[PDB]
Design a binder for this molecule. Structure first.
Ligand SMILES: O=C(O)CCC[C@@H]1SC[C@@H]2NC(=O)N[C@@H]21
Ligand SMILES: O=C(O)CCC[C@@H]1SC[C@@H]2NC(=O)N[C@@H]21
Ligand SMILES: O=C(O)CCC[C@@H]1SC[C@@H]2NC(=O)N[C@@H]21
Ligand SMILES: O=C(O)CCC[C@@H]1SC[C@@H]2NC(=O)N[C@@H]21
Lengths: 118, 121, 118, 121
């Protein structure tokens, strides 16, 4: 279910492969920010979720550096997968930028992305 | 190189990591607190080409709390930066999400911050 | 514009009064959690926003204690007001619970609420 | 009572506050960093009836960065707890939102954490 191509409210493209062992692998393409084309991503997820109606926790990282640019920063998405007729992945993220110790106080942005397969 | 090694945070948790030349991070994490025991696999990414100034190196990693002994049905992601030198440090802020029913979703995510100190290998 | 009765995706009721000086005052009633009836709230907002198309930053707090219960915790909402045909207040919150120093690591929840007048 | 007084965080910022018996917090804040100068009004709320155990006192306050000298078109909210005793502390986590256009909304909110130390009044 998790495996596939997903899109968030901003129009970004998330392409993941979920291994049976609990690994997440794929590429991420952002529709906004100091970025172009695809970026490697790696993460983990609960490969044995609860039997009740709970979602399956997951999380991945993306360092914003590839062959075209280096924004000198990383983003981590933490959230949960909810299956069904209209599957979705609701997350919250932390975008940290490399900074001098003097600007460390304003180095981390926080947001929330919702991904669907549409 | 700098990032690679054994680190510990203020909680007494252990962070063993290796930085690949492609910007990949792999290793194991051991939490001193929470519903967890033994080692859990971790995977992340970092800026393999930081600015040559006094800036830190942005990085991040995830850890799904499930191994061959326990499953907490949750995942934590650490987002922060590495700061080298004599006293190398990794200052991070994290998000720990628990799997929940639709009704309890609003209280599924905890937020915190850990500071890691590296041990002379 | 900010003044009025708002509702979030959870069904909670937010009733605010925005003073000309930049003060926020009102009551908050949550549809979920260890809470019942109304709770006092106080906050601040930019009473002189930018002339471009920017939203107006705002933020308020609610200690979860009233005549009926005391959940021993506080919530702060930080976000921005966007006027127009369909006004809304998009926010992100931090819910801190009073805890022993040993549980301090898991004392703060983080989320995001969207309020509309519907 | 405990909370009331002058406090400072690791950045060198000043936090003057008074705790009302109704659970209200009022005072002024002075930031050591950012687009700010002089004092800004603050308002918050706290648990005026904490648990008699070793628990902390939950509290929170907002500060819109606008006074008679500057307007940064932003607001910060601090959420945390007070911990009394010999060395009283206020450990918090904050959210600073900037007013932005619809297009830049995604990068409107910064997240951090401040620790406040009280000064013997
Ligand atoms: O400036 C950069 O480094 C690019 C930031 C991209 C960010 S990550 C969180 C948000 N979600 C998304 O799909 N794109 C933006
Ligand atoms: O899932 C659980 O119950 C274990 C949570 C462990 C958490 S992750 C953030 C925090 N840092 C750490 O070293 N340990 C705790
Ligand atoms: O258990 C409690 O203290 C009540 C928590 C209520 C929380 S505040 C963030 C979320 N938004 C809302 O409208 N209700 C919930
Ligand atoms: O709006 C601005 O540019 C000023 C931001 C000041 C921020 S609020 C969180 C942080 N703590 C503090 O004492 N100062 C900074």
């Amino acid at each position: 279910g998790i495996t596939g191509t997903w899109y968030n409210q901003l129009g970004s493209t998330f392409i993941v492969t979920a291994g049976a062992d609990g690994a997440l692998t794929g590429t991420y393409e952002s529709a906004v920010g100091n970025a172009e084309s695809r970026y490697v991503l790696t993460g983990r997820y609960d490969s044995a979720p609860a039997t009740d109606g709970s979602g399956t926790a997951l999380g991945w990282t993306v360092a914003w550096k590839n062959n075209y640019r280096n924004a000198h920063s990383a983003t981590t998405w933490s959230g949960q997968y909810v299956g069904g007729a209209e599957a979705r992945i609701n997350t919250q993220w932390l975008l940290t930028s490399g900074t001098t110790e003097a600007n460390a106080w304003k180095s981390t942005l926080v947001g929330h992305d919702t991904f669907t397969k549409v």
